Amino acid sequence: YIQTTIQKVTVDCKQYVCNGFQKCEQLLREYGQFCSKINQALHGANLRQDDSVRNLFASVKSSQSSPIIPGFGGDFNLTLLEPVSARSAIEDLLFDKVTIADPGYMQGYDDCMQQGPASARDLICAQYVAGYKVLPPLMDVNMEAAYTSSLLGSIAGVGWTAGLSSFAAIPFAQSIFYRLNGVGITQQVLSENQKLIANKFNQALGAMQTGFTTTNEAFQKVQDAVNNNAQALSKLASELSNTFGAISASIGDIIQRLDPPEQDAQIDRLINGRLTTLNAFVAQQLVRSESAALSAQLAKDKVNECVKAQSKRSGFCGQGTHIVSFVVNAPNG
Amino acid sequence: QLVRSESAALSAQLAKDKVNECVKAQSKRSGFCGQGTHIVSFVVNAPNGLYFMHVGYYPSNHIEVVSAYGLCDAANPTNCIAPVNGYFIKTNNTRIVDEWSYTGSSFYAPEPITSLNTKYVAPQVTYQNISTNLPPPLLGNSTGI
Amino acid sequence: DVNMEAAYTSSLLGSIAGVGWTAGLSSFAAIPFAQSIFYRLNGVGITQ
Amino acid sequence: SGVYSVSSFEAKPSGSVVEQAANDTKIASQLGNCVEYSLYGVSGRGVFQNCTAVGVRQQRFVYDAYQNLVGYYSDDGNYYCLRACVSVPVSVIYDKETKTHATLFGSVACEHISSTMSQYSRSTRSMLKRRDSTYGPLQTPVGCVLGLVNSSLFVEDCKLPLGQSLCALPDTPVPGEMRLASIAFNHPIQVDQLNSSYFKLSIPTNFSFGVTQE
Numbered sequence: 216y217i218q219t220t221i222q223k224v225t226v227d228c229k230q231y232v233c234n235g236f237q238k239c240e241q242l243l244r245e246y247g248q249f250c251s252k253i254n255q256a257l258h259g260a261n262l263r264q265d266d267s268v269r270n271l272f273a274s275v276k277s278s279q280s281s282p283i284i285p286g287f288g289g290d291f292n293l294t295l296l297e298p299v300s301a302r303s304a305i306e307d308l309l310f311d312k313v314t315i316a317d318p319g320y321m322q323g324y325d326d327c328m329q330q331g332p333a334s335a336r337d338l339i340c341a342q343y344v345a346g347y348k349v350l351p352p353l354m355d356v357n358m359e360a361a362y363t364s365s366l367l368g369s370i371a372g373v374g375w376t377a378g379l380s381s382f383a384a385i386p387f388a389q390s391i392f393y394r395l396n397g398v399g400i401t402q403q404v405l406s407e408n409q410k411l412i413a414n415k416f417n418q419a420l421g422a423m424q425t426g427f428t429t430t431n432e433a434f435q436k437v438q439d440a441v442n443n444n445a446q447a448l449s450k451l452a453s454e455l456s457n458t459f460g461a462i463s464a465s466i467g468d469i470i471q472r473l474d475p476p477e478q479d480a481q482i483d484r485l486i487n488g489r490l491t492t493l494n495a496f497v498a499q500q501l502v503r504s505e506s507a508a509l510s511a512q513l514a515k516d517k518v519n520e521c522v523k524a525q526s527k528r529s530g531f532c533g534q535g536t537h538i539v540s541f542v543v544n545a546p547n548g
Numbered sequence: 549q550l551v552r553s554e555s556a557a558l559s560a561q562l563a564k565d566k567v568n569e570c571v572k573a574q575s576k577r578s579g580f581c582g583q584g585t586h587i588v589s590f591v592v593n594a595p596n597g598l599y600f601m602h603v604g605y606y607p608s609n610h611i612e613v614v615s616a617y618g619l620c621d622a623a624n625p626t627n628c629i630a631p632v633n634g635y636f637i638k639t640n641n642t643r644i645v646d647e648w649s650y651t652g653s654s655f656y657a658p659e660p661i662t663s664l665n666t667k668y669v670a671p672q673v674t675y676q677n678i679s680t681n682l683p684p685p686l687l688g689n690s691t692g693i
Numbered sequence: 694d695v696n697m698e699a700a701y702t703s704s705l706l707g708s709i710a711g712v713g714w715t716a717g718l719s720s721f722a723a724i725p726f727a728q729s730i731f732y733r734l735n736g737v738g739i740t741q
Numbered sequence: 742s743g744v745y746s747v748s749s750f751e752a753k754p755s756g757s758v759v760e761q762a763a764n765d766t767k768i769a770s771q772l773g774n775c776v777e778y779s780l781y782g783v784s785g786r787g788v789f790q791n792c793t794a795v796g797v798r799q800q801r802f803v804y805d806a807y808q809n810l811v812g813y814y815s816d817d818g819n820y821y822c823l824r825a826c827v828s829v830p831v832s833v834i835y836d837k838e839t840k841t842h843a844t845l846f847g848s849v850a851c852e853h854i855s856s857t858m859s860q861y862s863r864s865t866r867s868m869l870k871r872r873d874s875t876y877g878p879l880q881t882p883v884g885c886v887l888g889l890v891n892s893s894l895f896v897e898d899c900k901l902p903l904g905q906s907l908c909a910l911p912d913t914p915v916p917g918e919m920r921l922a923s924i925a926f927n928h929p930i931q932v933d934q935l936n937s938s939y940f941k942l943s944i945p946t947n948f949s950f951g952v953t954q955e
Contacts, residue, residue: 235862258746318848324853348830351905376738380948383942519577571705581953583953607948608947609946611944614939614941615942657740
C-alpha cells in the first residue's frame with residue numbers, strides 16, 4: 216500500500232474559537248490575523264493535495280488500452296480484477312474490510328439531524344458542532360475506477376520492443392509467457408506446462424480473497440492511514456472540552472455567571488488555548504501533506520516501473536522474480 | 549530553517565540522480581525524465597537549484613495494422629524468425645498477396661525483411677507458416693555445384 | 694559565483710553528445726550533436 | 742479564483758425549556774427544535790428527541806466519555822435524547838476574471854436552506870447578491886449550491902473544481918451565471934484483441950518533439 220493523499224480538512228476558526236457568542240467575537244477581533252493565517256494555510260494545503268492528485272493520475276493514465284470484456288485473461292482467472300458492471304471485486308472487498316467512517320458529502324448535515332444515539336464519538340457529526348469540515352475528494356469513485364481499469368487493459372500490450380509509443384493488443388496469456396521466457400524459462404518448458412502454469416498462477420491470485428486480515432501488513436498500513444486521519448479529526452474535536460485554567464469550557468456558561476472584567480479574562484484564556492490548538496493542528500497537517508506528496512511520487516514511480524513494465528531489479532516490486540503487477544485504488548492511495 | 553534545510557538535501561540528492569540519469573545518458577524508464585519517450589535533457593542553473601529541460605518524442609496519428617508474432621518456413625518448419633525492435637506487418641503496397649514487411653516500433657514505415665532486422669528463434673504455435681515469397685532470412689540455401 | 698556555476702553547467706553541456714554509445718563512463722567520443730541525436734532516435738524504434 | 746470556506750450559519754433557538762422538582766415551556770411539544778434548556782441547574786442549548794431509555798434513571802443526567810450531556814430523564818416519565826444545535830457550513834466559489842460567485846452549502850440537502858436563511862444566524866451581515874436569476878437552489882452530489890445553472894456540459898479540466906467530479910464553469914466570453922459542469926474521463930485509444938494467430942498493432946505515423954520543464 217502506497218499512500219498518496221491525506222483527508223482534506225478546513226476549519227471555521229471564528230466559530231471554532233467562539234462558537235457564536237457575540238461577546239467572544241469582539242474579544243477575538245483584537246487578535247487580528249491569526250484565524251486568517253490558519254485559513255490560508257489550510258487552503259494552500261488543500262490546493263497542493265488537489266495538484267498532487269491531478270499529477271499522479273495524469274502520470275497513471277495510458278495512451279492506448281484494450282477493452283476489458285468478461286473472460287479477459289483467458290486461462291488466467293483474474294475476474295477479481297475485472298469491474299463489476301464500476302469498482303473491481305477486490306477493490307470493493309478492500310474498501311469493505313476497512314473500518315472507515317462514512318462522510319456525508321451530500322445530505323450528510325441532515326443525516327446528523329436525526330443521528331440516533333451517538334455512535335462512539337461520531338467525527339462526521341462533530342464537524343457541524345466543533346466547527347471544521349471535511350472536503351470531498353477531487354475525483355469520483357467511478358472516475359478513479361475508470362483510470363485504474365484503463366490501466367489494467369494496457370498491461371499485456373505494453374510492448375516487448377521499445378514499448379512506449381506503440382501498443383500491441385496481445386492476449387494476457389501471450390504476455391505472461393513472454394515475461395516467463397525472459398527470466399530463464401525456455402520455450403519448450405512453457406509449451407509443455409501451459410495448463411500447470413495457468414493453474415499455479417490462479418492458485419496464487421485466488422489466495423488473495425482470504426488475505427485481508429491482521430497478518431496482512433499492507434492492509435494494516437491502510438488501516439493505519441485511516442486511523443491517522445481519524446486521530447487528526449479527534450484531536451480537534453477533543454480540545455473543545457478543555458478548560459485552559461478557567462471556570463468552565465462553555466463560553467455561554469462563564470458569560471451568565473461572572474462580570475465583564477472577569478468575563479474578558481476567562482474568555483481570553485479560552486481564546487488563547489483554542490488558537491494554540493488550531494496552530495498545532497495546522498502544523499501537523501502541513502507535515503502530513505508534505506510526507507504524502509513524496510509518497511505519491513513513489514507511487515508514480517512504482518506504477519511506471521512495476522505495472523507498465525516488467526522490472527529487472529529485485530526487491531523493488533516484490534520478492535522473488537517480478538512478472539506482472541496490478542494496482543487498485545485504496546482509501547488514501 | 550532546520551526543517552527546510554533537511555528537505556533541501558534530499559532534493560539535492562534527487563537532482564544529482566536526475567543529472568546522472570537524464571542529462572549524462574538516455575533513460576529507458578518512462579516518466580522519470582519527462583513525458584513521452586526520453587531522448588536528451590539539458591540543465592541550467594536556477595535561483596535555488598537546477599532547471600531541467602527534457603526533450604521527448606511524442607507520437608501522433610496512430611493507425612491500426614495486422615501483425616504476426618513470427619514467420620516460419622512452411623517447407624522447413626523449424627526455421628523461424630522474429631522481428632528485432634520492430635514488427636512484422638501485412639503490406640498493402642499494390643503487390644503480391646500476403647506479403648510481410650518490417651516496421652520500426654515507434655514509426656510506421658514498412659521495409660523489406662532482412663537479416664539486419666530479424667533474429668532466428670524456435671518455432672511456436674502462433675507463428676505464421678508461409679509457403680511463397682519467403683523473405684531472404686527464410687530462404688533455405690540449396691544452390692550447390 | 695555565477696561564473697563558476699555557469700562554467701560547471703556549460704562543461705556539462707559540452708559532454709552531452711559524447712556520453713559514449715559503448716559502456717560510456719571511462720571514454721569520450723567527440724561526435725557531433727546531430728550524430729548523437731540520430732543514434733538516440735534509432736534506439737527508440739526508428740529505422741535508419 | 743478558487744473555492745474558499747467561510748463562516749457558517751448557526752441555528753436560531755426557537756423556544757426555551759425549563760424544569761424542576763406555564764404549559765408551552767416544556768420538553769414535550771418542542772421535539773426537533775433547537776431550544777435553550779435549564780434542567781435542575783444544568784443549562785445549555787440543544788435539540789431534544791425521543792430515544793429509548795438508557796443509563797440509570799435515578800441519576801437523570803446521562804453523559805458521554807467527554808463530559809457532554811447526551812440524555813435526560815424528564816419529570817413526565819420519558820427519556821429524552823439530547824444533541825447540540827448544528828451549523829450549516831458555507832463556502833464561496835469565486836471567479837476573478839468575470840468577478841462572479843456562487844455559494845456552496847457544505848453537505849446540506851437544500852430543504853434546510855432558503856434565499857434569506859432567516860431561520861439561521863451568523864456574524865456576516867448579508868448574503869451574496871444573487872441577482873434576477875434567483876431560481877431555486879440546485880442539488881449537487883457535493884451539496885446544495887446557490888447561483889449555479891445545470892449545464893450538462895463536460896470539460897477536460899477546470900480551474901475551480903467543486904468536488905467529486907464537479908466544476909463551476911464561469912460564463913467567460915455582463916457575464917452570466919456560473920454553470921455546473923462535470924469532469925469527463927479522457928478515454929485512451931481503444932485497440933481490440935483478435936481471436937487468431939494475428940494481433941492488432943497501433944502504431945504512429947507522425948511525431949513531434951516536446952519539452953518538459955522541471
